[PDB]
Amino acid sequence: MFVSDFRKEFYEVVQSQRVLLFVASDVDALCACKILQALFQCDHVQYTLVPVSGWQELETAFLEHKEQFHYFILINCGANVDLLDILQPDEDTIFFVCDTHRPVNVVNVYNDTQIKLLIKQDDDLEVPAYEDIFRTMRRRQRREWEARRRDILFDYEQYEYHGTSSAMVMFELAWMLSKDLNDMLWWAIVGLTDQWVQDKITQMKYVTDVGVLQRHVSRHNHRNEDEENTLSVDCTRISFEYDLRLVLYQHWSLHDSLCNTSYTAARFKLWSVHGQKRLQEFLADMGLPLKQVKQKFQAMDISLKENLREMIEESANKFGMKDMRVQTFSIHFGFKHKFLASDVVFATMSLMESPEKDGSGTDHFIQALDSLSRSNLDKLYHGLELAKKQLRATQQTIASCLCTNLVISQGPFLYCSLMEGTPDVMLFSRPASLSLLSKHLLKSFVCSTKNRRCKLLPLVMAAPLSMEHGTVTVVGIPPETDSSDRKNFFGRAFEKAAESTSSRMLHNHFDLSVIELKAEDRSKFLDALISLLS
Amino acid sequence: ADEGQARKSQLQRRFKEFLRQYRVGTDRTGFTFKYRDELKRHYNLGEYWIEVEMEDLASFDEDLADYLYKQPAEHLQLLEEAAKEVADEVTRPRPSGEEVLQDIQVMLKSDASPSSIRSLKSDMMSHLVKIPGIIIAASAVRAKATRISIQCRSCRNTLTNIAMRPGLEGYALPRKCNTDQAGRPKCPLDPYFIMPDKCKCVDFQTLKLQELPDAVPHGEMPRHM
Ligand SMILES: [Zn+2]
Numbered sequence: 181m182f183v184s185d186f187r188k189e190f191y192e193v194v195q196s197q198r199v200l201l202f203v204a205s206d207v208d209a210l211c212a213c214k215i216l217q218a219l220f221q222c223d224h225v226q227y228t229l230v231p232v233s234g235w236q237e238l239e240t241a242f243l244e245h246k247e248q249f250h251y252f253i254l255i256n257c258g259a260n261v262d263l264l265d266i267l268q269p270d271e272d273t274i275f276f277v278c279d280t281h282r283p284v285n286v287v288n289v290y291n292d293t294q295i296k297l298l299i300k301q302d303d304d305l306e307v308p309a310y311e312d313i314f315r316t317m318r319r320r321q322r323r324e325w326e327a328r329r330r331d332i333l334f335d336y337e338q339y340e341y342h343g344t345s346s347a348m349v350m351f352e353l354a355w356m357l358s359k360d361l362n363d364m365l366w367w368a369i370v371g372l373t374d375q376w377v378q379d380k381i382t383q384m385k386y387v388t389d390v391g392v393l394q395r396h397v398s399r400h401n402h403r404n405e406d407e408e409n410t411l412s413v414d415c416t417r418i419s420f421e422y423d424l425r426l427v428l429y430q431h432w433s434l435h436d437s438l439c440n441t442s443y444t445a446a447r448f449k450l451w452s453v454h455g456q457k458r459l460q461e462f463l464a465d466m467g468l469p470l471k472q473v474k475q476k477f478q479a480m481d482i483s484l485k486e487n488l489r490e491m492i493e494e495s496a497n498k499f500g501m502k503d504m505r506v507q508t509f510s511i512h513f514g515f516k517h518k519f520l521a522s523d524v525v526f527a528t529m530s531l532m533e534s535p536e537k538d539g540s541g542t543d544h545f546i547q548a549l550d551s552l553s554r555s556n557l558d559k560l561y562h563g564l565e566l567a568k569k570q571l572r573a574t575q576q577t578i579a580s581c582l583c584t585n586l587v588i589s590q591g592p593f594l595y596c597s598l599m600e601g602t603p604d605v606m607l608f609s610r611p612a613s614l615s616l617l618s619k620h621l622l623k624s625f626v627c628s629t630k631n632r633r634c635k636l637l638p639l640v641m642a643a644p645l646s647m648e649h650g651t652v653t654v655v656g657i658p659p660e661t662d663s664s665d666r667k668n669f670f671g672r673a674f675e676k677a678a679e680s681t682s683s684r685m686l687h688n689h690f691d692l693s694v695i696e697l698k699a700e701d702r703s704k705f706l707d708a709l710i711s712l713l714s
Numbered sequence: 715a716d717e718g719q720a721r722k723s724q725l726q727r728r729f730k731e732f733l734r735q736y737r738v739g740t741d742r743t744g745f746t747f748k749y750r751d752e753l754k755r756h757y758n759l760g761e762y763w764i765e766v767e768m769e770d771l772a773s774f775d776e777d778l779a780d781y782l783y784k785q786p787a788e789h790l791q792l793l794e795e796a797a798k799e800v801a802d803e804v805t806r807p808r809p810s811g812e813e814v815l816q817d818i819q820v821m822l823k824s825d826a827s828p829s830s831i832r833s834l835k836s837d838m839m840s841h842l843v844k845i846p847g848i849i850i851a852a853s854a855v856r857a858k859a860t861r862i863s864i865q866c867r868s869c870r871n872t873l874t875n876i877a878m879r880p881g882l883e884g885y886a887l888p889r890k891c892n893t894d895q896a897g898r899p900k901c902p903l904d905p906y907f908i909m910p911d912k913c914k915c916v917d918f919q920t921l922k923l924q925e926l927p928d929a930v931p932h933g934e935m936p937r938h939m
Contacts, residue, residue, distance in 0.1 A: 414741045433827075471833075478769055479826030482780050515736065516773035555742040 181289070182297045183276075186353040190276055190298060191219070193251070199227045200249040202238055202257060204690055205545055206612065207374035207528045209256035211347035211367040212278060214552050215354055216253070222359055231545040232257065234688035235266065242267050249273075256280060256346055257690050262287045263295055278349055280342045280380070281690065286313055286333070303343040308332050339667040340692050342380040347371025348389065355396070362400050362416050367552065369393055369418070369509045373521035374529070379619055382666050390507045394420055397509065416513040416554075421520070424489055425506045427571060428523055431564050435474045438462075440571040442620040446627040447501055451579035466495045517557065527563030528552060530570045535607040570613070573604040578621050587625050589634055590706065592713030593656075596621065598643040605644060611653055611694045614643050618657045626660050636661065638668065640709070645696060651686070652702060656693040668693055677708035722792060725781070729789075729796035732774045753797065753818070754804045762816045764797060768824035782822070786842040787880075794820045831925045831937045847923035847939065857915035864906040866891050868899065872909070 183189050199220070203213045213229065220227045230245070232238040238257060246267075252275050254263075259279035264287060269275070277288065278298040282305070288295045289307050299305075312332055351368035354360040372393065376386045397418050405411055426444070429437035438444045438459060448462070449455035463473055472480050489505070496504040509521050531548035551559035580602070581587055587596045596618070598605050608617050618641040626635050638658050645653045656670025671692025678685035683701040697705060733753070739745040752764050772779035781789045797818040828844045863874045864887060871894055878885055891905045925936040 414745070474827070476826055478772065479824065481783075482776055514738075514740065516770065517740075553742070554740045557740060 181292045181295065182299055182301055184301075186298060186349070187356045190296065191353060191357065193274075194253070194276070195223055195225055197225075197251045198249055199225060200245055200252045201227055201229045202232045202241060202252065202254045203229060203545075204256035205231060205233045205532055205541070206256055206378075207525055207532070207548075208280065208345050208347050208371040210528060210532075210545075210549055210552060211371035211374070212255050212345075212350045213549065214367045215347060215350040215364045216255070218361065218364060219350075219354060219357065219359060231542050233541055233545075234690065235261070236688050239267060242269075246270065246273070252276065254279065259284050259288060259297060259299065260340070260690075260692065261285055264291065269294065278346045280344065280346055280375070282341050282343050283307075283336055283339075286336070290314065298346075298349055300344050300349065304341070305343075306336075308336050338669055338672055340669075340671045341665075341667040342375060345371040345375050345389065347374075348392070351396070360396075362418060363554070365393070365396050365400055366416070366418055366509075366511050368396075369521050370524050370528070370552070373508065373525045377522060377525045377529075378616065379666060382664075387507060390509075393509070413515055414513065416511055419510050419512070421508050421510050422489070422505050423508050423510070423520060424492055425504050426492075428526060428564065428567060430477050430518065430520065431523065432568055433474050433476050434468070434480070435470075436568070437477075438473075440568075440575050442574075442623055443501070443504075445575055445578075446620075446624040447499075449628060451575070451582050451624065451628075462495060462499055465499070466491055513554070519560075523564065524552070524560070526567040526571075527560055529612070530566035531559070531563040533570070533607075533610050533613040534566055535604075541610075570607070573607050574617055574620055577604055577608060577617060578624050581621055582624060582628055587621070587639070589637060590640075591710050592637075593709070594622070594625065594634070594637050594639040595706070596639065596641045598641075600644040600647075608643055609645055609653065611655065611689050611691075614641065614653055615655050615657075615691075615694065617641070618655050619660075622657055622660045638670070640670070640706075642697075642702060644699075650699045651696050652699050654695050654697050654702070654705075673709060673712055674705075676712055677705050680708045680712070681705055683708075725778070725789065726792040726796050728775060728778055729793045730799055732771060732778065733796055733800045736770060736774055738770075750800065750804055753801050757801050757805050757816070757818075762801075763819040763821060765821040765823055766793070768822060768826070783842045785840070787840065790820065790822075794818060830929050831923070831939050832929075832931075834939070845923070845939070846926050846929075848926065849921055850924045850938070851922035853920040855917045855919050858918040859913050859915050861912075861914040863909045863912040864888075865909050866905045867902065867907060868905060869894060873906075874912075 201213060201216065203209050217227070217229070219225075228245070228249070230241045232241055235257075238254075242252075246269065250273050252273065254275060254277045256279050258275065258277045260281040260283065262285050263269075263275055263277070267275075271294075274294060274296060276296050276298055282303070284297060284299065284305070284307070286307065288297060290310055290313075313329055345368070347368045348371060351360060351364055354364050372386070372389050375381045381389075397420055400418060411417075425441065426434070426437040427441045429441075438448075439450055444459075445451070448458045450459060460470070463470065468484060472484055477485075493504050496502070510518060511521075511524075512518050528548045528551055531551050532544055534544050534547070536544070547559060548563070550556040551563050577598075581596055587594055589595075598608060608614050618639060621641070622639045625639070629635065636659055638656065640654065640656050642652050642654045645651045654674070656668060656674065658664060658666065658668035658670075674685065674693070674695050675687070677683070678695075678697075681701065681704045683705045684698040685701075685705070686696040688696060733749045734747075736747065736749055737745045738748050748770070749764060749766065756762065756764060768779055768782070771782070778789070782793070794817070797820050798815065801818050802815050822842075824844060826844055828846050831845055831847060834843060834845070859878050860880075862876050862878060862885070863872060864876065865872045869891065871891060873888075873892060876885065887904065887906045887908075889903075890901045923939040925938075927936065930936050
């Protein structure tokens, strides 16, 4: 059931109790965890925090901790499955679920005692009515009703997508409690920007949520500040920006930013040998010297920078890149620390999905979670360096795929596969980084190919995962049209193929459109996918 | 005109406020006055130098950093004089034998990507440049005068504490005797001579910087600077 008021029916309940946070491995989950940690630390709520990277380790952690905790909070996990069946809880536990995944499972919706959904009722939700889903001529009509149930429930469960950011939900809770600090607002901004960077939401919804956050930014910017009374440089200042879509461009050279941003790399076709001359034509049209463009942005001459954003937009419009600007936010504090929300997103994401083998994925979660606090600015800057490396590896992998023509149109969907031992495959073995790679590669492919047919197809990408057990990670991506609503069917198409072929499919990641598959079964799995999508 | 001196005074004040106010850290952890602390400790150690980061200066006041890049010779001496002021007000009072304030050498470093020796073209003359290389030769350390005084041979008219411009530039002694009337003799053609006991000198060295081996174009010998 949906929690109507977060303050009354969730926070004031768990405020008196020991609580267990299960937190998923993504930047929005991390930001929601930071906000909720801050509230609990204000109120001396003795919580325990456990990272979980998948369903099986969530089940393991719950089996470990179910004896000692009666109140659980799941951040960016649980809403899209039957948690009662998955975890098999005791009759009197409570699971609060703050999760962006949609559609919410009908058992989660209509469970009225144990599952409590911290989900805004005004999200994109169309739940079927209870009587349509739950309980001679009489039994004939019973069977007819069951057939109608199967039809309706397939129509409900078909398309998976994402709702409002969990960080924004927790910030609204903090605002209702009136314990909303400026760093909490920054964490909310970073969660929404994580959704936008990973393309989990439409541009319309992102602009609407930015419009929501602008008012909170104005309120915080007038708590103790106006045009004639101003604070120390120590204090944090969040500012609304109509900034550039380039990635990390204030922390490395504008050349590296243009080369390693997905949009401009795809448009200029910089994987190709000819694309560098297109980029040089763009820079010459702007009138920026190449030495300045290749110099680091902080060391670039200041006479080039104070109208650079509108210069970029003006040149991009006549080059056909009609939307180089983006509505975003920045944070300043001290004399020299300045970050865009995209910069913090990429740094934290890289700290999570780092290619380092030392430690473990939970240690990398811990590094990412530490980097979001300003007591660990060294960790944030290290994450920025790792993000530069990750972006470069992404472009090299895209270039390899397109140059070798690994992307082949398998009728209903394009298909690509990474190969074991090839460069950076270990970096992209992790499902989140693989999803980002597949999205960037699909944009690059759509800009590359001249066929009108290929510009509309979705894409399925495979990569090696295991040799001790011999498996691969497979992801499904929707088409990259500007008309797209950012919903995909691959979460259900994969399991329909898997059950049609009786394939050894394992379903550990929280997104249904990412799976693990035995390397032998991929042939018949793909055959079933072509047969299914038709 | 003296409006130039007014500009110099305000720019020296701004450099002084950079060295007085710059901090590193966060309010969650704590702050340290980086350049005040370095000035204090180096002066007490008897070092009398600091190294300033161009990015720190640019974050504090980007106009000062731009001025140092475009016109380093003009503005570095203002920065060094401001460093001397901050050293005085950071170390005062001092024990006996340390009453006389010392000059501070301000060094520069930056995070910017460097240029090559073959990037140095006539457009960049007198600008601040950053280049890599290998030291292949180094001369003996020798004395360069920073302040001199010159006395006239006829009337013993003296000019005191003439500022010597830094670098390999020298100084032109006045062609004719200064500030007094054209008497008899008017002037022998070099009226002035440098007084031996009043010169203040600093160490200087000459080195040869060779181009890095991997920066050389194919077929060419490495250049020297
Ligand atoms: Zn004379």
